[PDB]
mmCIF file of C-alpha atoms and ligand atoms in Angstrom:
data_model
loop_
_atom_site.group_PDB
_atom_site.id
_atom_site.type_symbol
_atom_site.label_atom_id
_atom_site.label_comp_id
_atom_site.label_asym_id
_atom_site.label_seq_id
_atom_site.Cartn_x
_atom_site.Cartn_y
_atom_site.Cartn_z
ATOM 1 C CA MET A 1 0.029 -0.008 -0.004
ATOM 2 C CA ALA A 2 0.935 3.676 -0.095
ATOM 3 C CA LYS A 3 3.143 5.738 2.255
ATOM 4 C CA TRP A 4 2.553 9.406 3.166
ATOM 5 C CA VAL A 5 4.990 11.853 4.815
ATOM 6 C CA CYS A 6 4.166 14.337 7.558
ATOM 7 C CA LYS A 7 5.633 17.474 5.986
ATOM 8 C CA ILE A 8 6.269 18.948 9.480
ATOM 9 C CA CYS A 9 8.319 16.246 11.226
ATOM 10 C CA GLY A 10 9.048 13.480 8.675
ATOM 11 C CA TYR A 11 6.921 10.707 10.182
ATOM 12 C CA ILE A 12 5.807 8.228 7.528
ATOM 13 C CA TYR A 13 2.214 7.059 7.670
ATOM 14 C CA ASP A 14 2.628 3.639 6.084
ATOM 15 C CA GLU A 15 -0.783 2.309 5.157
ATOM 16 C CA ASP A 16 0.605 -1.242 5.628
ATOM 17 C CA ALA A 17 1.594 -0.371 9.225
ATOM 18 C CA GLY A 18 -1.457 1.594 10.217
ATOM 19 C CA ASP A 19 -1.200 3.353 13.590
ATOM 20 C CA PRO A 20 -2.456 0.712 16.061
ATOM 21 C CA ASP A 21 -1.315 2.570 19.203
ATOM 22 C CA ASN A 22 -3.742 5.286 18.208
ATOM 23 C CA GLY A 23 -6.699 3.260 17.035
ATOM 24 C CA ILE A 24 -5.759 2.523 13.426
ATOM 25 C CA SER A 25 -5.363 -1.082 12.223
ATOM 26 C CA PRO A 26 -2.633 -2.091 9.680
ATOM 27 C CA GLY A 27 -3.926 -1.781 6.227
ATOM 28 C CA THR A 28 -5.983 1.426 6.689
ATOM 29 C CA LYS A 29 -5.785 3.846 3.745
ATOM 30 C CA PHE A 30 -4.907 7.453 4.496
ATOM 31 C CA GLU A 31 -8.265 8.676 3.194
ATOM 32 C CA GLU A 32 -9.985 6.436 5.689
ATOM 33 C CA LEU A 33 -8.213 7.888 8.719
ATOM 34 C CA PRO A 34 -10.712 9.849 10.811
ATOM 35 C CA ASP A 35 -10.818 13.555 9.982
ATOM 36 C CA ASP A 36 -9.311 14.397 13.418
ATOM 37 C CA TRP A 37 -6.479 11.787 13.338
ATOM 38 C CA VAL A 38 -3.132 13.533 13.741
ATOM 39 C CA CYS A 39 0.503 12.722 13.222
ATOM 40 C CA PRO A 40 1.468 10.625 16.269
ATOM 41 C CA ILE A 41 4.774 12.319 16.568
ATOM 42 C CA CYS A 42 4.086 16.073 16.133
ATOM 43 C CA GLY A 43 0.287 16.329 16.208
ATOM 44 C CA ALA A 44 -0.122 17.803 12.716
ATOM 45 C CA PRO A 45 -3.537 17.450 11.118
ATOM 46 C CA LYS A 46 -4.132 15.277 8.091
ATOM 47 C CA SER A 47 -3.785 18.297 5.810
ATOM 48 C CA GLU A 48 -0.028 18.318 6.473
ATOM 49 C CA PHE A 49 0.675 14.923 4.935
ATOM 50 C CA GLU A 50 1.742 14.355 1.359
ATOM 51 C CA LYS A 51 1.393 11.035 -0.477
ATOM 52 C CA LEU A 52 4.785 9.640 -1.600
ATOM 53 C CA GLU A 53 4.180 9.065 -5.263
ATOM 54 C CA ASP A 54 4.585 10.939 -8.427
HETATM 55 FE FE1 LIG B 101 4.445 14.950 12.110
#
C-alpha cells in the first residue's frame, strides 16, 4: 500500500503499518483515517501529509 509523509516532522504514515497505538489497524488507507487523526509524533492534522508518489 501507499506511504505518506508528515511534511512537518518526517513521520511516515505507512498504510501497511497503520497506527495501532492510536486506534488504526494495519492496512488502513490514509483517506480512511478519521478527519481528526493527527501525526502521532508532532500532532499535525491530516492536511499536512503528502502522499509519496509521483
Ligand atoms: Fe508529524
